[PDB]
Design a binder for these strands. Structure first.
Ligand SMILES: Nc1ncnc2c1ncn2[C@@H]1O[C@H](COP(=O)([O-])OC(=O)C[NH3+])[C@@H](O)[C@H]1O
Ligand SMILES: Nc1ncnc2c1ncn2[C@@H]1O[C@H](COP(=O)([O-])OC(=O)C[NH3+])[C@@H](O)[C@H]1O
Ligand code: NI
Ligand code: NI
Lengths: 519, 506
RNA sequence: GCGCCGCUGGUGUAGUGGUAUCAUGCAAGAUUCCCAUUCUUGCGACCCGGGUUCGAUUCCCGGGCGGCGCACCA
RNA sequence: GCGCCGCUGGUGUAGUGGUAUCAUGCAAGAUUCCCAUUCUUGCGACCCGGGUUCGAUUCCCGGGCGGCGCACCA
């Protein structure tokens, strides 16, 4: 704070220096941007405990165990293109599934599925075509042609949003002409980046989950907002940024009423995003919501930024883009894209009975790749004893493998019990990994922990020797383990994977494991 | 034997799917799935994951759609679907050939026409990666290549042991000349593909016994040349007779049948056709075909691709793609060395699922019209795949019903049961029609007995039969949920619950 | 792609060189109280561009889309 | 994109104008019987194309990819 104070002051001076420069585009918010960048960097350099991940170790684990890899690596690879392996894909679908329960099923959102191929007039209308050609000229989008030859120039969608806007009329009709409603699409988006860098952070193809919440401007207040009002989270307002200030933990309700956040609709989604991101493993102490300043924005915009080894990175944008995309496409195509509400008292010799409503749009955009990479960092740990033993503390709900089945030895008496358990878990819908390899139980614990297997069932000698056949259940993080009846462990593991019990509750109900005594 | 027009009218009106970019004129071969269609699709995909990936512990991966040119050159897709064409130019780089064609003054070998300079004719979607344009690429025409190119790490993930299977679910692109017939011929469609890697020595599947008893229609190549029609056979009994080459092909054929059945394709309008030697390399191929108003269409293609995929890519990149297994004992010019393991180049069995066609088949196989009203159309979607498991319906717009609607909906949501609430203006029969139309599996109706009787009970209605029972509102979510998971059927419900003889109040 | 015929509210449908009929659907208010009830009101359309014309939804051309056929079908 | 430095089994790391070290990982056999145990054996690598050369993983041009810094960031 002693080293940061002068840089804070500096940002502040050039801050409302700018406000003065317009109080009565020569002006350089570029100068302001530089100063804040300095402050940002040095605050970052001052903070580490070191509190932060050994990126090279974590990337090694991800690589070795095929969480994700360079696409076409066998052909030399293509910059900015990545494939997800078994664990990567599994973790992804879990993150997407949780996203579906958290947003779509919760708010009864209308999820649609649109083509990635997009004709040129659509993107010229939204201004994507005009805004992303550059200095021979090269476009930051992927251009292609549809059909015969070059009869129809098209692009790969840069975003998922436009498919919703263009289907507004049938979406609205499906909600029977009533506002408000929301549509969503989960799919891939394409950015022909001139320089893909930092692994999954900036890629040329990535999976995006987008939501367009359509709402009557006359009615921009969310009914469920007090479900998130008392949440305390870090906010970084435009005022705070230009004041040279840092982020500040506030109450959501306060920030909305004080007017820091425009409305309770935008606020609701900020709160819901917070709840979601933390649910999938992102750390609250390493998560902030940063408002967009004047030189980056639309009524209001807030990015969700997570602190990583690469610094602060946006993982979820949440914009208020009242009227535009609906209006822009409307004029472009001459097709009216609006809602209507019946006037109470009918009304320029025409008598009106309804008034047309141009809906406002609230748009949360989720970059699942970055969200996933953030989870990787925020859940990566190294065992205190063995530096080779690394593991991921994935929340049970998103852990790719909920369980592992482990005979204590390659010994044969265990094998029928192992077969029993796998099929049982398979019929309980419980994702599991069976390891009956030549390695010791410690080696195979290490393998399983490495990919974030939530719990480990170990078949021992007392599984076969004593009257009630009982295996041990092991917690990935604490490495502590209990003992329970093979009959019921698939139910117990299923429960932990769904979040209907916690490991503390399990340790409470079932006896602790002091050790083998049959041998 | 369906009214395809009427069905498609329903699909269009309730936004199952639609022409992509319709308000911009539209683009042929491109379709956007609306809420109900998307929902149905997701259930189809999840059922697929449960039926295959989870059941066989398959390694599912997720690759990019952008594919560099050399990859598709190797697999042969370029030299067959990407070329300039006089009709055709290769017979004898870019428009460098146009000069060559004029320099040697090549008229057509037939008819001797003067013809045109070669113009590019891409059946694939070409594009350029990077800012330079030094890296031409295509949208993948299939999801298999991502699996083949990551074979080493997949094998390593299975600790080097064969056999193992990998799968992928994503979009694939084909720049069709003439997109037609709705979803049956599109330019972009979601595909589910499995690559089952097996030791050529042991081209078997231990779990074939689980499907051997299935009676299904088979249409072998030797029966196609004869002219005779397809025969209903025991799946096990196609295998000892050598009609089906091996237990691996047999197992997947069985599993494909059980899946297509489970999602609602009618067993009588489903057959498996063996590819003839005329249409092939590859060891053997059996397509799953379904009977539609467009005829017999291929919706799942089960192929046997001995080696090529792994071998071609290996030879192309000079990167060996093999499994090794140990020998019983070390064995021994060109011979002087000691061997301890032998290399195995995996044989690949490939079930290929076209989700769009599968879904369209379900549409035609579950579309029905009520016996009284010709406006009342509905889909008999199986509960486990139906886009909306349940609907909440107040008998009227009276305020007495509203609080029960609100409570039951929230209950359903917390149980995860996907539901739709129709408390709008219309009558009860209207909202029944409205919800049957999109194939809502079951309908909960809140009536006057619900508000005026000692324990609060509502009715649960079956979409198909239109019959209904009565159970209390606390019970219904668990009931509907168990119907959706396939735990119970309607028979079970009518056995445990009182049939609805009419309301005694109001 | 090549050939023919087409494109009118969300869905159908009538009509025409002077900007459009009527059903259905949805909305509102009544009615009704278990299977698109009935009444009244309201909302919503000539695929797009160009040509000819004082004026085009209508006539000519082109593009887009559609239906059928031939062609191709990783 | 520009700039600078890099690319050796799945991972990490020596080394060289005559095709390569040692760990780690996996496999097999023993060992051990609750936290990468131990011994033996086996498997697997010079990013790719062209050139120079009797011969290149090594030297030289080009390409791809990676790590950074600056840009840009729907
Ligand atoms: N090149 C890239 N690579 C990976 N992820 C990206 C990306 N560009 C954006 N994202 C992620 O996708 C989200 C949306 O990106 P965006 O803000 O550029 O687009 C939109 O918001 C669409 N209106 C971001 O919040 C970010 O997490
Ligand atoms: N143009 C198209 N439109 C919709 N679905 C298609 C399609 N082309 C192929 N499919 C679906 O994809 C599946 C596989 O197609 P294919 O046989 O051309 O490719 C293969 O051989 C898989 N390697 C088919 O069974 C079909 O269901
Ligand atoms: Ni029409
Ligand atoms: Ni290496």
């Amino acid at each position: 704070e002693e080293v940061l104070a002068p840089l804070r002051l500096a940002v502040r001076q050039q801050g409302d220096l700018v406000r003065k420069l317009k109080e009565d585009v020569d002006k350089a918010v570029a100068e302001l941007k530089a100063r804040k960048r300095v402050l940002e960097a040095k605050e970052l350099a001052l903070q580490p405990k070191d509190d932060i991940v050994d990126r090279a170790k974590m990337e090694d684990t991800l690589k070795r165990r095929f969480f994700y890899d360079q696409a076409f690596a066998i052909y030399g690879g293509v910059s900015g293109l990545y494939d997800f392996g078994p664990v990567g894909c599994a973790l992804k679908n879990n993150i997407i599934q949780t996203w579906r329960q958290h947003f779509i099923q919760e708010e009864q959102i209308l999820e649609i599925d649109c083509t990635m191929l997009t004709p040129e007039p659509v993107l010229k209308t939204s201004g994507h075509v005009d805004k992303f050609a550059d200095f021979v000229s090269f476009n930051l989008m992927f251009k292609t042609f549809i059909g015969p030859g070059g009869n129809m120039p098209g692009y790969l969608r840069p975003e998922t949003a436009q498919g919703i806007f263009l289907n507004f009329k049938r979406l609205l009709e499906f909600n029977q002409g009533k506002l408000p409603f929301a549509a969503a699409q989960i799919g891939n988006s394409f950015r022909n980046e001139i320089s893909p860098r930092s692994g999954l952070i900036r890629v040329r193809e990535f999976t995006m989950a987008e939501i367009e919440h359509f709402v009557d401007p006359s009615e921009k207040d969310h009914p469920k907002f007090q479900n998130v009002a008392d949440l305390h989270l870090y906010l970084y307002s435009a005022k705070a940024q230009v004041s040279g200030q840092s982020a500040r933990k506030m109450r959501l309700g306060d920030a909305v009423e004080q007017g820091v956040i425009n409305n309770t609709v935008l606020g609701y989604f900020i709160g819901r995003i917070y709840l979601y991101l933390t649910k999938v493993g992102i750390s609250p102490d390493k998560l902030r919501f940063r408002q967009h300043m004047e030189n980056e924005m639309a009524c209001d915009c807030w990015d969700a930024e997570s602190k990583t080894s690469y610094g602060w990175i946006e993982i979820v944008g949440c914009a208020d883009r009242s009227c535009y995309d609906l209006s822009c496409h409307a004029r472009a195509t001459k097709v009216p894209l609006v809602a209507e509400k019946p006037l109470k008292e009918p009304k320029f010799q025409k008598t009106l009975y309804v008034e047309e409503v141009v809906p406002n749009v609230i748009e949360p955009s989720f970059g699942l790749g970055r969200i996933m990479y953030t989870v990787f960092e925020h859940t990566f740990h190294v065992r205190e004893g063995d530096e080779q033993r690394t593991f991921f503390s994935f929340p049970a709900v998103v852990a790719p493998f909920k369980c592992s089945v482990l005979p204590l030895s390659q010994n044969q008496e265990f094998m029928p019990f192992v077969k029993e358990l796998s099929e049982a878990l398979t019929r309980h819908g419980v994702s599991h990994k069976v390891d009956d390899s030549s390695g010791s139980i410690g080696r195979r614990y290490a393998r399983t922990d490495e990919i974030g297997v939530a719990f480990g069932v170990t078949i021992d000698f007392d599984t076969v020797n004593k009257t009630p056949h009982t295996a041990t259940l092991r917690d990935r993080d604490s490495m502590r383990q209990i003992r329970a009846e093979i009959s019921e462990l698939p139910s117990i593991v299923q429960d932990l994977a769904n979040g209907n019990i916690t490991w503390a509750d399990v340790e409470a109900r079932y006896p602790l494991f002091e050790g083998q005594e049959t041998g």
